[PDB]
Design a protein around this ligand. Sequence first.
Ligand code: SC4
Lengths: 213, 262, 262, 272
Amino acid sequence: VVQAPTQVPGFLGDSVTLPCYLQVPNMEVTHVSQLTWARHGESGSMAVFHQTQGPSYSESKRLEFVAARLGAELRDASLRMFGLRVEDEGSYTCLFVTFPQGSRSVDIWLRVLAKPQNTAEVQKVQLTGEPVPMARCVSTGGRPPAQITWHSDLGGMPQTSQVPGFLSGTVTVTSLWILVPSSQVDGKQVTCKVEHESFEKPQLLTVSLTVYY
Amino acid sequence: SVRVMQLTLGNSTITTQEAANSVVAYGRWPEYIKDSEANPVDQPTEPDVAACRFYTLDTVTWRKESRGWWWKLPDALKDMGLFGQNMFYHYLGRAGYTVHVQCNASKFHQGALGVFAVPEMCLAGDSTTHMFTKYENANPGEKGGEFKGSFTLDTNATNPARNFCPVDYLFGSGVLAGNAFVYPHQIINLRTNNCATLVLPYVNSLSIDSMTKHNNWGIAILPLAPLDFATESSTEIPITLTIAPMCCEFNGLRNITVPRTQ
Amino acid sequence: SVRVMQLTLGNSTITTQEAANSVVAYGRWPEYIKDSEANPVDQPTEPDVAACRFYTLDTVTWRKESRGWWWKLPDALKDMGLFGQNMFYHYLGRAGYTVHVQCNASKFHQGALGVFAVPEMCLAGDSTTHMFTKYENANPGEKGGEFKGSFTLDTNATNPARNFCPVDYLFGSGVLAGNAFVYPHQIINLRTNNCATLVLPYVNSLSIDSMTKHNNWGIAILPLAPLDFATESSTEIPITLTIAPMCCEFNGLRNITVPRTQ
Amino acid sequence: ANNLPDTQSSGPAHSKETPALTAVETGATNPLVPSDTVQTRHVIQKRTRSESTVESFFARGACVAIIEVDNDSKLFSVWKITYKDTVQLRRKLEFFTYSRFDMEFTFVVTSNYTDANNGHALNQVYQIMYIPPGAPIPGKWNDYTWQTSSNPSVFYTYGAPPARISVPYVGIANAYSHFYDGFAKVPLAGQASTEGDSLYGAASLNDFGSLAVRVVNDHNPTKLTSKIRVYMKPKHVRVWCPRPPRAVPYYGPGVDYKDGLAPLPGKGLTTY
Ligand SMILES: COc1ccc(OCc2ccc(COc3c(Cl)cccc3Cl)cc2)c(Cl)c1
């Protein structure tokens, strides 16, 4: 039976794998077990991972095939696409062949495009009233735009305007800044939470303030 | 030579000094209905020289950003002299055509235009409602239409446009444009020729039909290689279309047809 | 016409739309050894299509400052596919050639290249020691060599270069270059042609010889009128050389020859 | 459906004839063969194009409809005759603008109990009635229309080999139109917009009529469903004016598109 889990982000840069798992029940085991991959994709009719005995690269030069092949296993095979440009989607499929019924499988696809970088800058001098002190949360390089979120310590947060996306090489860039008004203290752990859902926990950057005179 | 020609029909003559031969669609020259293929029994009218002559439709301009143009026959000629009169006064009509596309530039310009003559050139619409394009939009007349770089669905439910949305690479009908070469065509590559000439016989599943309800041929012009010049990001060269109906014969005379417009 | 041609040898075809005819050296087309002129008694090998085909040697670039280039045959083809294999496996070898030099520019460029095919093209050395050029230097292979504007004597006694010093106006051999026109040639004058084509029969004082010890023909290319363009002091146009051996026959098969290099 | 020409041996060339050079602007394709650009040997050609003839290309029964009837108004169903309800045969036919042929229809009938442990019924007999445009359409699974005194009917007994009938070329034109760039009406100046409006690319509202299917047996309270799969094969085929095949998904009876507009995959320009 077909049990492919591949609905994968998929991280860009790159590079990451495009897996295909077909767990085999269980008393009516499967051969011949050649594995085909069809893209989705201006398919007329190839960008294919096919594997008869020796793994055959149907011409998309930017491919890596990692399965215990030339012998057999059978197929919980992993593919990899590098690289490194956003040759995106579209979609991809994973179809097997079988002596019993199984010259068949399922189409399964997902995401791609890319992660960002962040830094904080705070200025300038306070002549009020009553805008910026000013904390800026710059977000450079991420086509699927990173959801920048400025929060802090008090109800002096509702004030968060954005620089939208004037995209760099394939990749989108933004800058959230605050503003935050007036007056004195240093002094608070005002934290910008930049996400994108890659890496570990979202980019939490805490800073200070320019207090003058 | 393959490059110099003169076409004379009625009181009109066309000369060219940079042709690339001429194409006769499917190898068939236009002809009149034979008695063995005749259907309507009434005596036909054959205007001859009054209708079978060269009519120049409006000139379009080619720019680096152009996606393409299209026209429908006999539609584009419905207001052309006595051809249009006979078309509207008769229930049935039949005609072949000599399509002459004109486009001159210079030895420092580049670009290639694909000129295709398509029988039953059905185009794609703009809504989720199938075959929703309305008569007035499907028949633009001499001004014809244009191809687009992408499909954009009309969502105004209150006032649907009911128009075509011909995407260029999809040949305006859901097929790949690179395969449009299976239709009679010529290419106007600026470094080689001035024009394209196609002789089209009458094509249909009937010997004669209603010219107002049905368009037999479609003319599609697509920039295969975009227009470019010296260093002028700014470049415009006109494309003039001259068409002449051939072997016109009409049947079923009555009062004149006045179709609804806009 | 004199200007359009197509040459087909084996699996290779060359087309040209700006030729100036072709020269057949001494009016002799290459041929195989006749029984009446035969010498080695063993059965010859004749690779035919595997060796008699067009091989493209490295492209050189012509600049305002270029003095000229030279190659030696069969030397320049010693590493070319199955021709080179047969050359090294046999003691004796014989072949004719079709030399096709390629050089295109534009209508605003000037320059003329003299392409000469010289039988027994012996070149002058660089030292006071006579006939001192060493084998490795005399046989550069596909990269060939270059002409110089002046003679410069090698004085390093400890490590003599033992190389050639072909001065251009002296045709690299002590004769005036203007008289090199007594040898089969063509001229690639940029305002007239793209190429030069020469068919060379086998020339030697023997019917067959050692291809490794002896070079039968020499190809010399000299800028008769220097390269010049619009106002670009900076101008470079490539010169590609494509040669095809003809009527190859080898005698005296043994183990392969591996000559010393550099 | 015949032979291909032999390859003649071809030697070297050095001439003013250049078949390799051409000018595609003319609208013509360069008719070169291998011997025009390379040296060839003589090969006696034995391959033929017997299977790619227009006839052999279409000589297959393709499914065009799956009519369903529930013998417990569903006691009978009506299917408007068309080849556009499915995609496979439709795409093949659309390689051409016009066609003319005879048709062979084969009907594969299957049925089963909805309930694993309930009900029973005696062997079923089906009636497939063709209702030509104009004839009265059945309102009940048992009204007067099923008398078929003039309409052609096919009575199929469940379990018997698939039923099969032939239909002649029935078009009102000299050929079937796969594409019709026009309307059935011309809106006239002055009439209300509701007036003279018709579908683009549509001819008759009822081109070929429809099929009315029912089970003739008296229905039992048992839950049963039957499906009649209609297979059609064009025989004695003639086709005119080739067209490029459908590249994007079909979106209705027209040439309309909407969804799979990006059919081609990515591939490096210099990647083999
Ligand atoms: C261009 O491609 C075409 C053209 C016409 C077509 O249909 C025309 C058509 C007309 C009448 C009948 C009626 O046939 C039947 C009869 Cl008499 C009796 C019982 C059952 C049937 Cl089924 C069936 C098909 C089709 Cl399916 C494809």
